[PDB]
Amino acid sequence: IVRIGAEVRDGDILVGKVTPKGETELTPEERLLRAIFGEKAREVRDTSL
Amino acid sequence: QTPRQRLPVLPCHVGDPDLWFADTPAGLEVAKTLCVSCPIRRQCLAAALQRAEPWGVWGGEIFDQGSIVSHKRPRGRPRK
Amino acid sequence: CEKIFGPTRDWECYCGKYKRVRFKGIICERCGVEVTRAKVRRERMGHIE
Amino acid sequence: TLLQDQLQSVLDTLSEREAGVVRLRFGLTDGQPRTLDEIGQVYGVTRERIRQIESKTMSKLRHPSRSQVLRDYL
Amino acid sequence: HQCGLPKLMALELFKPFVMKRLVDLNHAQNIKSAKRMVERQRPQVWDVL
DNA sequence: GAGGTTAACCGGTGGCAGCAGCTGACCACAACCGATTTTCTGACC
DNA sequence: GGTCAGAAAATCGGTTGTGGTCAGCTGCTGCCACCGGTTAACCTC
Ligand code: SF4
């Protein structure tokens, strides 16, 4: 959560919470793009306040 | 009218990309000199170093199948 | 019953073998279902005998 | 949908042999990928030559000069 | 024939139109970048709007 | 007054996931060589 | 004072080779879900 006194604006993050979404199947196009860019699979889904 | 990022400033993708894979050492010299004006030669060169490029101009530098080259020899007998 | 009222995911047969859009309208002898969209659960009718 | 169209355009910016090699490698024309020697069989060269072409083509696609349009599609 | 409109409402109302226009003026090269720019309310959106 | 009964408890089956060991498909890479083809040099004298 | 000829590149392409690694396959390993037999608890012939 944010610090006390931190001025916020519209839509900013107040609590950083990320949920285990499990693993779903992958489109071949997303597979190709992930092979191109080389990133984490990101097996969790963000639900932030 | 654009107000975009530094992508047209970025001299990697200004012209034809196949120029950057020139099959002539002279033909890629323009490409290598074109990244003298590149803002991001350090991180790009570092990324190309760590990812073990097989080919092409990278960070203002050509790459062999494994590593860095001075510059490729052309076809024919090497000189003295 | 998925065999009657269609599948529950988009082009997903029930055992899990056929999962591709290249398969379409193909009934699967192992699981029983026909590969199609999950929208057919809106309008597929059954009857009681 | 815009990602698919941009992918088709950038895939067609390169030549047809490596283009169909990538298409058969990733199932972008049928939904089913092929083995390396399968692609080598349906083209006409050996699978190691296929692998060299595939690796250098993957590097060419990885290059920023063609990754400009796909830099921030994630 | 005129009527007023507050900008924090009209920006929300005309959001896809302004997304298309500020992609066409290259202030954001993709739709997700346009959406984040509209959410953060960067000052170019008024002259587009 | 145990006879007869009774919820639960107490052996006794088939189903299934694991699961470690066993293939062969299939790729990594690695050299490595092989025609090709320039092309430079190298004596002829 | 030209002149084939050789050496040595690189470049696309086989090759071999080989090594490993993993998808999966599948017979033991063992546990887990019905099925019902039995065993101490309730109502009074
Ligand atoms: S290779 Fe050089 S010029 Fe091209 S994008 Fe990378 S850093 Fe910039």
Ligand SMILES: [Zn+2]
């Ligand atoms: Zn099935």
